[PDB]
Design a protein around this motif. Sequence first.
Motif, PDB file in Angstrom:
ATOM      1  N   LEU E  11       0.820  -1.208   0.000  1.00 12.30           N
ATOM      2  CA  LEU E  11       0.000   0.000   0.000  1.00 12.30           C
ATOM      3  C   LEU E  11       0.853   1.258   0.000  1.00 12.30           C
ATOM      4  O   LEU E  11       0.529   2.234  -0.690  1.00 12.30           O
ATOM      5  N   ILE E  14       2.027   1.619  -3.361  1.00 11.68           N
ATOM      6  CA  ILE E  14       0.930   2.080  -4.211  1.00 11.68           C
ATOM      7  C   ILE E  14       0.834   3.598  -4.163  1.00 11.68           C
ATOM      8  O   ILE E  14       0.847   4.272  -5.200  1.00 11.68           O
ATOM      9  N   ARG E  15       0.807   4.151  -2.947  1.00 12.91           N
ATOM     10  CA  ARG E  15       0.700   5.598  -2.793  1.00 12.91           C
ATOM     11  C   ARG E  15       1.962   6.312  -3.250  1.00 12.91           C
ATOM     12  O   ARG E  15       1.878   7.412  -3.808  1.00 12.91           O
ATOM     13  N   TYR E  17       4.216   5.219  -5.679  1.00 12.73           N
ATOM     14  CA  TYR E  17       4.357   5.169  -7.126  1.00 12.73           C
ATOM     15  C   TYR E  17       3.233   5.918  -7.825  1.00 12.73           C
ATOM     16  O   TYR E  17       3.424   6.404  -8.943  1.00 12.73           O
ATOM     17  N   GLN E  18       2.064   6.038  -7.188  1.00 16.03           N
ATOM     18  CA  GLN E  18       1.018   6.864  -7.771  1.00 16.03           C
ATOM     19  C   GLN E  18       1.282   8.342  -7.557  1.00 16.03           C
ATOM     20  O   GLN E  18       0.931   9.155  -8.415  1.00 16.03           O
ATOM     21  N   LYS E  19       1.905   8.712  -6.438  1.00 15.35           N
ATOM     22  CA  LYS E  19       2.355  10.087  -6.287  1.00 15.35           C
ATOM     23  C   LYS E  19       3.554  10.395  -7.166  1.00 15.35           C
ATOM     24  O   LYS E  19       3.805  11.565  -7.458  1.00 15.35           O
ATOM     25  N   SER E  20       4.294   9.379  -7.591  1.00 11.01           N
ATOM     26  CA  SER E  20       5.462   9.575  -8.427  1.00 11.01           C
ATOM     27  C   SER E  20       5.068   9.588  -9.893  1.00 11.01           C
ATOM     28  O   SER E  20       4.081   8.971 -10.297  1.00 11.01           O
ATOM     29  N   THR E  21       5.857  10.299 -10.690  1.00  6.80           N
ATOM     30  CA  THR E  21       5.669  10.354 -12.130  1.00  6.80           C
ATOM     31  C   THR E  21       6.853   9.774 -12.890  1.00  6.80           C
ATOM     32  O   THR E  21       6.995  10.030 -14.090  1.00  6.80           O
ATOM     33  N   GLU E  22       7.703   9.004 -12.220  1.00  4.94           N
ATOM     34  CA  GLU E  22       8.941   8.517 -12.809  1.00  4.94           C
ATOM     35  C   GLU E  22       8.674   7.399 -13.808  1.00  4.94           C
ATOM     36  O   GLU E  22       7.597   6.803 -13.844  1.00  4.94           O
ATOM     37  N   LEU E  23       9.682   7.121 -14.633  1.00  9.19           N
ATOM     38  CA  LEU E  23       9.628   5.991 -15.550  1.00  9.19           C
ATOM     39  C   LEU E  23      10.053   4.723 -14.824  1.00  9.19           C
ATOM     40  O   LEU E  23      11.139   4.670 -14.240  1.00  9.19           O
ATOM     41  N   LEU E  24       9.203   3.701 -14.862  1.00 11.88           N
ATOM     42  CA  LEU E  24       9.423   2.489 -14.085  1.00 11.88           C
ATOM     43  C   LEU E  24      10.126   1.392 -14.867  1.00 11.88           C
ATOM     44  O   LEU E  24      10.304   0.291 -14.339  1.00 11.88           O
ATOM     45  N   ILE E  25      10.522   1.658 -16.106  1.00 16.31           N
ATOM     46  CA  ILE E  25      11.269   0.714 -16.929  1.00 16.31           C
ATOM     47  C   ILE E  25      12.640   1.312 -17.203  1.00 16.31           C
ATOM     48  O   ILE E  25      12.738   2.464 -17.638  1.00 16.31           O
ATOM     49  N   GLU E  60       4.289   2.119 -20.878  1.00 16.54           N
ATOM     50  CA  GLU E  60       3.944   2.375 -19.484  1.00 16.54           C
ATOM     51  C   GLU E  60       2.482   2.767 -19.331  1.00 16.54           C
ATOM     52  O   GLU E  60       1.780   2.231 -18.467  1.00 16.54           O
ATOM     53  N   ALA E  61       2.009   3.684 -20.179  1.00 14.86           N
ATOM     54  CA  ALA E  61       0.618   4.128 -20.117  1.00 14.86           C
ATOM     55  C   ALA E  61      -0.344   3.005 -20.475  1.00 14.86           C
ATOM     56  O   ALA E  61      -1.364   2.812 -19.798  1.00 14.86           O
ATOM     57  N   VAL E  64      -0.401   0.501 -17.557  1.00 14.70           N
ATOM     58  CA  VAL E  64      -1.121   0.896 -16.348  1.00 14.70           C
ATOM     59  C   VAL E  64      -2.618   0.994 -16.627  1.00 14.70           C
ATOM     60  O   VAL E  64      -3.433   0.734 -15.732  1.00 14.70           O
TER      61      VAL E  64
END
Lengths: 77, 106, 106, 98, 97, 95, 95, 86, 87
Positions: E11, E14-15, E17-25, E60-61, E64
């Motif tokens: 959790l 979750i909060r 990575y949702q508050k983050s705008t970074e590239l996860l790859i 990514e988009a 998600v």
Amino acid sequence: SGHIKRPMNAFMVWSKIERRKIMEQSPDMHNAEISKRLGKRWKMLKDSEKIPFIREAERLRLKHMADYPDYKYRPRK
Amino acid sequence: KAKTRSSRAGLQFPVGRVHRLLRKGNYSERVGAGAPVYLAAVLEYLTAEILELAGNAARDNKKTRIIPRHLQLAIRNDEELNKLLGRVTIAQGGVLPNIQAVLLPK
Amino acid sequence: KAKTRSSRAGLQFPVGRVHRLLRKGNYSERVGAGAPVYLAAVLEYLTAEILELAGNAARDNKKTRIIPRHLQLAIRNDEELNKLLGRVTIAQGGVLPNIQAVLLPK
Amino acid sequence: KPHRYRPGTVALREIRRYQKSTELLIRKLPFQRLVREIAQDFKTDLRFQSSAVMALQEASEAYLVGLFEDTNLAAIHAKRVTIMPKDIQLARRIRGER
Amino acid sequence: PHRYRPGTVALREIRRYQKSTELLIRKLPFQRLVREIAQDFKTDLRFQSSAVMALQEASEAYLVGLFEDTNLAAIHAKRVTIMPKDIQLARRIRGER
Amino acid sequence: KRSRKESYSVYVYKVLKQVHPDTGISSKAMGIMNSFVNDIFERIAGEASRLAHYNKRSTITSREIQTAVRLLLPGELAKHAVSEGTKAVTKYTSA
Amino acid sequence: KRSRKESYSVYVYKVLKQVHPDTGISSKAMGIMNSFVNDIFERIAGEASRLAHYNKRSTITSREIQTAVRLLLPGELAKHAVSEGTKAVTKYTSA
Amino acid sequence: KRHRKVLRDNIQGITKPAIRRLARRGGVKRISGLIYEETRGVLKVFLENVIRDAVTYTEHAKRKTVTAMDVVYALKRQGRTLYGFG
Amino acid sequence: KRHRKVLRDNIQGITKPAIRRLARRGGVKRISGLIYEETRGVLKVFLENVIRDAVTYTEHAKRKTVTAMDVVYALKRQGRTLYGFGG
DNA sequence: CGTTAGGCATTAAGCTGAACGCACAAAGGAACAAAATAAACAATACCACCGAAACAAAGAATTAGAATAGTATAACGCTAACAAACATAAATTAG
DNA sequence: CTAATTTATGTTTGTTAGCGTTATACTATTCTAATTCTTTGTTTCGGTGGTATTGTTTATTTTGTTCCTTTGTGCGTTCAGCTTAATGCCTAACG
């Protein structure tokens, strides 16, 4: 492994000796911030301070061309 | 003696009408002369692919007419025509008859 | 003394550039003179609606810059801008932070 | 003692005969009345061609049949056969409708 | 030892990575994957760095979006998890199969 | 002395008699084929127009149509249509 | 002596300084606003073009733009945009 | 007597054993009791969107009646193309 | 323990923590172990589509490289327009 | 309705110098990632039930069909007159 | 920081609203025919709740593994100005 490495330029040997200097004077420092500071200081150096490094790089280039005269770059997959 | 542009390419669709529709359809200022011939070719091949599967469906149903139930059957049974016409629905066509295997009894 | 067409309508977007894009965009043969003025009006109002919500998001976050996280927040939080930009995704934007209520503990 | 079928037994035969047959399943006159009722609120005193109401009926039946296919997919996925309105709302939500 | 409850760290991530705008790859393996797939369609295909960044951002988009639809379908079936049947259903109902 | 509906109704029947001589066709199925021909014409010409705009070409030649065919039509339909098309321009240029 | 990228970057900043004087903007958000302006321009001009074709009109006037605005933009955005537009042509015609 | 009139409560005209046939065409084996009003509402919002698009189409043309060609264009703008009307 | 290297398999680079992060952005509380290979295949077919369209774009213009605009135009046609990389 | 013979003016193939874009040298922990593990909570298997939906027969009530008359309306053709493309001179502006 | 890009004026032209007419499908009415929607009484079965087993995910720690940010140099790719043949559009004629 038989791979020919690229010869060092001015900034690589300069950042090498100066990063060794910073790592013998400063503990607990991350190397990305070191290289950011080293690029910053190299762009605030005057060109009057860099001629030994570029000349040494030119000596490595003439050593490289005299060591491999029939050399041509071949990128592979 | 002069011969038509539709049979110059050896086709059925009129090259002049698709040329006129490309002109007045406002797609560019100019249009190449190979463009309506190519477009009539791909069009004629496309409805040939539709009508061949439609005739095989209607002959498979022991009918002699093409009703749009045959067109819907010929389009939905195919794979690469179903991707071309996936969003398009067909008037008086019905659905492809297929029932999920868990609804059926054992 | 002559005054520009963008401020003839009292706007910021250039009427001449949208007129030129309507001409060379190949949408019709002719285009009416009220068309670029109307289009610049609806365009200027539209980015005004974007930038006002973006500035309120960035001032709500105690920031002073508009980063695209603020644009994604301002678009996804809205209702009638979300229908306009539902399929469009935003570069470096992230998602609207919302978690389903059954995943959360009691 | 009259003979009675079982629930679901007649349902498969109805599914088969309605998938085979291609006619419209809702009557043309209530659809005419509903379309003329709805189109008052955009402009009063509109005349509807019979071909226009028929085209609206074709697209209406197509949209509802596709939505009920997706509803059956979602209800089968949750290990049900009796579809429920939450399946309709889910299949609308995934589809990009709302 | 004091290990967290299963999901509480999830959790917080979750909060976060949702508050983050970074590239996860990571950029290098995605570059390798793009230049590994695209050789099959045509050889000698270099990519601009903006192009592979755009491909990573759009994937990514798309993922998600696929995963929020997947979690919708999984919550709908009374499940907290994600099973691949949820991904199958979310791709089928969207009309991509 | 009504004005005439310009449509593709005769040529679909010509193709049908070329490919299936025994079976007839309805009128409403002929209208469906007319609508399908116009739909595919709009798709291919729209992709050809936007490709000529993306390359700043003011002329749509057969290359744009070939690329748009490879864009829209999936599977073996693409290469079959391209072979039919190139056969048609080689026929049209040989004559 | 590079050729210049023709874009809407200045006017988004002008609108921003009209509506929000204190907050600045990024560069990549300015690029997002440029892409959004071009996307909405393509949507409105495409609907205006196909409406002029469906009515066999060779001229796109403000009526087609108004109808396309009422077509695309949902909710109160439609009538707000129409009021802004008619205010703009009354301003442009009064002068 | 008078041509002018007003309509009301026409959503009950699409009846429950006429919803069941549209459901059982799509392959549904069992239909719950609360499906009907929700499907009528779904139909209502879909018809409202496509009819509003058709009304704007016919009102741009300075016309007073609704053809089928405008319904076809309205369904084209929603991305559900209809074949069979031109 | 010891590091393992596998030849080719370009899809595999997309690692398992970098998919758990993608699902945590989507608001997912639990991911089963059978999700990573399926998500890899989904990403593979998505990139196959977009890459094939961009390759046809850059091949029509006779360009050996793939610019950003070609990826924008390839993603526009599938209903997912990218903002930010230029129009 | 559809095709064909000569200008001409626009347009894509051809070519070369130049500018862009990308990889890569060292660095050296940082940040990431794979692997092994404890166990805890989630998926699931099974069972009861009960009320909810299917099935059926009857009648009602609704739609279908048809003839028909009015009838708003839409789709044809002339006509003006109006609005927009086009040729040519400022200006401000902006990357 | 001055070329370049929008703006204004008059001319042609070609598009379109106004007008008339008329046809034509639309709407309403009233009959029979048929067909199907709604009521009411079975009946049977699937959604839902509750409990127990199990199977597998998560969170963590350890140990590899990579990465990242910095400038200059080499090489391949693209692009823009200039040349030049290709070609498609317009007109007149024919069928």
